[PDB]
From a paper:
The SPOC (Spen orthologue and paralogue C-terminal) domain is a 15–20 kDa protein domain found across eukaryotic species from yeast to mammals.
The conserved lysine and arginine residues cluster to a basic surface patch similar to that of SHARP SPOC. Although RBM15 SPOC dimers were present in the asymmetric unit, SEC-MALS analysis revealed that RBM15 SPOC forms monomers in solution, which was also the case for other SPOC domains. RBM15 SPOC has a preference for serine-5 phosphorylation but also binds phosphorylated serine-2 and serine-7 with similar affinity. We modeled RBM15 SPOC binding to an 8-mer CTD peptide phosphorylated at serine-5. In the model, phosphorylated serine-5 is tightly coordinated by the conserved residues K795, R834, and K898.
Residue numbers in the entry:
A (entry chain A): 7 to 93, 102 to 186
B (entry chain B): 8 to 91, 109 to 186
The structure:
């Protein structure tokens, strides 16, 4: 049964919009999430995660998401459920706050997963980095939702499934 | 992180069992882990039996609040029970306790203990103004409807736990 630990709270960013979100652990290694959802240089907490790329939801991409989880192994991935969270001129990054449903609807219509490189700011060694793929509700993402998970996921318009994979190849 | 699953099993009332998952809201996880056991062995228990009730009146609720406070930070744990010898959905237990206007009472550990400091009491509250105070916004999302959860308040021992 999914642990549902509150692994992260903050804003997802896409260009000039931000979306408050709470992320709950569904499966995999909580430590994979806690070690990558950070500022890369310090390991410190980050309040924003920026979607910088899109992955198409075509079957060949989905099959590679599945394969990279299996390659990484039980200590090399985490899957989270992202649900809506709780709702200056010199700021180099401006953004309109929007409900998570906006981002969900966008990714559903674009038929894409959002890509977030981790940790924030990167790292020179390929093996201490990772990637989060943010999937909208769809047949692929529903396979990771058991009955207690769906209760959190109120509607097919209000959640994302976040798949974090650490490193390159098998994780030990 | 808050909200991790801390116990999975059946809540027992009379001749019915209600599968429940308990997630940590507040307090000391170790209070729950050490008391949600079979006393004679310290091992995992799959069932917890409600054997008493406490009415939801104001002087009793004020005293629950006081007992949480006096226990200290290692003396209590608060958990959210969500749906997880006839099996019934948890909402039937919720409806029953809502109708009776009472909290269920479970003595811990299962089987008791001769030393008070190694025992606890779990009060299982239905949704109400009092129990809602323990749910922040992230927790409210797990709670779903006002018919589908209980708030489990575990207090260890007697007075401040030190």
């Amino acid at each position: 049964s999914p642990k549902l630990c509150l692994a992260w709270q903050g804003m997802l960013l896409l260009k000039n919009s931000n979306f408050p979100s709470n992320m709950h652990l569904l499966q995999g290694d909580l430590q994979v999430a806690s070690s990558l959802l950070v500022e890369g240089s310090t390991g410190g907490k980050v309040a924003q995660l920026k979607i910088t790329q899109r992955l198409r939801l075509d079957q060949p991409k989905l099959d590679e998401v599945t394969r990279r989880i299996k390659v990484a192994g039980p200590n090399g991935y985490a899957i989270l459920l992202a649900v809506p969270g709780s709702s200056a001129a010199s700021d180099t990054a401006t953004s309109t706050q929007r409900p998570l449903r906006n981002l969900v609807s966008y990714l559903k219509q674009k038929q894409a997963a959002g890509v977030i490189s981790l940790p924030v700011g990167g790292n020179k060694d390929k093996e201490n980095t990772g990637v989060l793929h943010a999937f909208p509700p769809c047949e692929f993402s529903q396979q990771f939702l058991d009955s207690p998970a769906k209760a959190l996921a109120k509607s097919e318009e209000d959640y994302l499934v976040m798949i974090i994979v650490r490193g390159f190849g098998f994780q030990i």
